[PDB]
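User: Can you write out an input/output pair for a complex, sequences first and structure second?

Assistant: Here is one pair. Inputs:
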Amino acid sequence: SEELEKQALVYAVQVLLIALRAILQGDEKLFKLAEWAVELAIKALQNGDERQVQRAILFMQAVILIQIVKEIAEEARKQGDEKLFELARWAIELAEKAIERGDEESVKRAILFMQAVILIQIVKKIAEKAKRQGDDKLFKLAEWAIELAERAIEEGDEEKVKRAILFMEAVILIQLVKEIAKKAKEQGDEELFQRAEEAIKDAEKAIEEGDEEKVKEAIKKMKEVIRIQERK
Amino acid sequence: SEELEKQALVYAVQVLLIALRAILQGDEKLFKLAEWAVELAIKALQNGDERQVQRAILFMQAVILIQIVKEIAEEARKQGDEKLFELARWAIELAEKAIERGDEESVKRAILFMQAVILIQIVKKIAEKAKRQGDDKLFKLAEWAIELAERAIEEGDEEKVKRAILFMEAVILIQLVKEIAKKAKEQGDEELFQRAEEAIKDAEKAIEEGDEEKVKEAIKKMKEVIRIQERK
Amino acid sequence: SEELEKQALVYAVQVLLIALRAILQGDEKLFKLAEWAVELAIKALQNGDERQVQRAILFMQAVILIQIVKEIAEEARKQGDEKLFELARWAIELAEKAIERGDEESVKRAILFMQAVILIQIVKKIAEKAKRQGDDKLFKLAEWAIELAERAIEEGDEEKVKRAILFMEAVILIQLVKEIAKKAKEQGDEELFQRAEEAIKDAEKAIEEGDEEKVKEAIKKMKEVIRIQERK
């Protein structure tokens, strides 16, 4: 499909902006990695080859993710999160190594680690906003999810980081569905408030059992409540 | 459509060259604006939305226009046109702010100002082309179009400035309709020398008439003289 | 959905990487050449013209080839090869001139010369490979191809150079078909062992330099041995 090559071109220009940032921040590793990924994308494009674009898109994704987690690591070092700094710094070095190595599935591994680190940055902000609002039950959930995802990165288990991304994702969506339930009380619309309340509890209780399976069901039923707010 | 996304990619690569020129011509404000517009374009493409890609194309147009008017402002600064320098500088700063603000309606305003300034640079050159050539009288008309577009910014009238672009555009059209008009000795440009003269005379009086109903018609009928030359 | 404009878009990003390198090595000549080619490509694409893209694709190829032959000249300065350095330096200068003007007839000329210079870098390595492992043929052949390709470039001859590349390529393909015959002893196969040996001599015996007709045939019969292994 003429769609895989369009992202190969779009991600190439996207990584090119990162290469300009590497030109103006003094970094040579980031510039060379960015050039490497964009060059691989071009070499994939020039033959009308489909598997080479999947590989080069994975490399461009890893370069963009390195750029994101590098600034997130700087943000964590600035804001006094020395542990999140080391976890991001670790995932950054592992991604850089995997790209220098050329191991396609190890980049997939490192890309997953960077996704969890970014999700930890998000759940931390949601947890701190939840404590700002005085909630100690979503706070317990969000804190239990970050403290379970970081422990998983401390071990480097690829299938335990995937499990922790599941919980973190549901905790992020509980925020949305809880705001929607709060606003579904203002119009008088109870067909949106019941649906949101059912998705909140069935996701919170899913994390209460901590079952890898019941969070997936909660995610789809949470999706069928966010879907309704996305209609209007 | 697909043609809109290829235009977004072409303008993206086009603005990136401008960002490359910013490193070697000394401007860093231009680099940030270029990075901003290209980032919005890339992420606009990555979601396939029709208004936001049109929006990012409008912003990339504004960044390119800033680059053009910046070279025009320096050229006016060099050639002792401090008045054209300040109007270009004003349209440049308003464009930068309109993008910095994110107000699309302010970007359209500033983009309109930048094109009008660019048209002022051109209509001045047709007057200078008259200095290169002999004298066809007129000349005050081109000056009347240049100095009325300049006055147009002093009021910022919404039902104006486009009118001044209209006059400047027709004065720019004097260039084409007369270049072909020169070729008419014994062969007499296919004998349709009258049609160029009919477009010349009925436009000369039209710009003096200050009309906005039929001067557009005169502009299109000058193009129907260019149309036949566009075949050969 | 046509495809040549996608080739122009890929080459644009490819030349942009070279333009990033020109920004950081102090070289502005390459930046101007890169800017010229990419701008010509961008403005050709934005109106859907096909002939202008064929031109711009030819020019972007010349800018990339300039980047390749410039680093080859840099490599030649280190290893003390004044002959390859000056031939590369000449092939670069004519391309730079041809791009600066926009002359299509000189770009084709300069691209061909850059093709021969790069092929001389390759045949040099194949000649040294034959000398290392005690070869009584290839050793003389590869050296004779180098000494005749340099002969054509030393003159700036557009016509006589269009002949030495044939031998250089055939000497390069003898390497491949000899590797295939050597591996056709290792695999246990019989359809790649007889015919690869059949293709080797048909190129080796084609030592007839005044042949100028069957060197293409030897290339095609080597293509009829190498290409089939490219399936699996």
